[model samples]
Target: SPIDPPGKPVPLNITRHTVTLKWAKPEYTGGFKITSYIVEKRDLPNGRWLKANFSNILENEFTVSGLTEDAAYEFRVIAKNAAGAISPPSEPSDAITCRDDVEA
Candidate 1:
């Protein structure tokens, strides 16, 4: 069976120009052990999708930085199993605009 898509993403440790992203394990593992994960991002207001710098991420969490402050962004994740099965992307995270940790 094909790998099951991951759960919805969440943002953690957010700050100006950066946010740590996390997701839950896939509901199904495609009858194999999960090998890696893919993370992708897109700016809000209808921006083009850009795959994150890293692929085959061994963990379920990643941090993205260098974003424009106050710019809205979202992310998603996909899981791959040892059998080379790739899962569908999880639902996009709720839109969040990067901003200073301490409001001025």
Candidate 2:
């Protein structure tokens, strides 16, 4: 089994088509060094979880883009260890609305 998942992601710099988020490191490491992270996203209301990053994320912060305007979404992060074990997802972020702020 892998170590515990990372802390909940905190949304920042939200925009109509993108959002930046940061999370804390996992409390446990499963006796292995963390290799990278994986970010996931879900559209609000009714949506399936989807991978947000195509490549390995080596940091605790990431910017998720390509969001549909006017939609709401949430995000989470998972940790992968050197042993190739992946942790459960972190707590989902608060639902955030994506809309043009300058339009109105």
Candidate 3:
């Protein structure tokens, strides 16, 4: 393995169709620079993991969009190294619901 898995992602800024997430870098990098990260998500309870970002992410924070309103989802992150090896997936985030925060 070129790198160890990243820390679990923390969800923030939840909204009806989007959520921002941040996570910690991997503890070990296999002595190589981290190239990019891959973000994945799945609907709550039971859903296949799907790529959240069309392209590799360059930062530890990302805003995932296109969520179905009222649906619940969880997320995880994977790290890629300069050596082209990908680390294992990080622990999944707590399930979060996609819904408007305001009540009217």
Candidate 4:
């Protein structure tokens, strides 16, 4: 049995040299424990999602790889549990813009 959170969070509106991402804890955590969050990014309209380079993410907040200089991308994250399984992607955060001539 799993209990869904009331609502999802819209990733904070912020930007960093390397795309610092963060989210608030869910109101509900289903029937499992949130072992970690798996964040992904996709080039809008096409291409498969590429795993963003993540730093020490033992915590809910994480800073992913830097963004490209003027590129369009879609992002979504999911909560995982001890089962090593993942839940459906949370309501995707509002689209954001990032680009600074970053070297991929």
- Among all candidates shown, the one with the greatest TM-score: 2
With candidate 2 superimposed using the best TM-score fit, by how many Å does residue 97's alpha carbon deviate from the native? 1.2
Error of 1 at 68 (Å): 2.0
> How accurate locally, in lDDT, is each candidate?
0.72, 0.79, 0.76, 0.54
TM-score for each predicted model, relative to the true structure: 0.82, 0.88, 0.87, 0.65
The alpha-carbon lDDT assigned to residue 24 of candidate 4 equals 66
Candidate 1, 1-104: lDDT as tens digits: 65677778788767667778888877667687677767667788776656664645778887766566777777777666778777777787766677556464
Error of 1 at 58 (Å): 0.9
lDDT of 3 by residue, 8-68 (tens): 8898677777878888887778886677777778887677777777666888888777676
Cα deviation of 15 in candidate 2 (Å)? 1.0
In model 1, the runs with Cα more than 4 Å from the true position are 100-104
Q: In candidate 4, how many Å is residue 62 off?
A: 1.3
Q: Evaluate residue 94 in candidate 2 and report its C-alpha lDDT on the 0 to 100 scale.
A: 72
lDDT of 3 at 104: 18
Q: What is the TM-score ranking, best to worst?
A: 2, 3, 1, 4
lDDT of 4 by residue, 8-92 (tens): 4345433523455566665555556666676676555463666674552456666555555355555566666545555666555
Q: In candidate 4, list every pair of residues with a backbone clash.
A: 3-30
State how far residue 9 of model 1 sits from its true place (Å).
1.0
lDDT of 1 at 94: 63
Give lDDT: candidate 2, residue 99. Answer: 80
Task: Give model 3's TM-score versus the native structure.
Answer: 0.87
Residue pair clashes in candidate 3: none
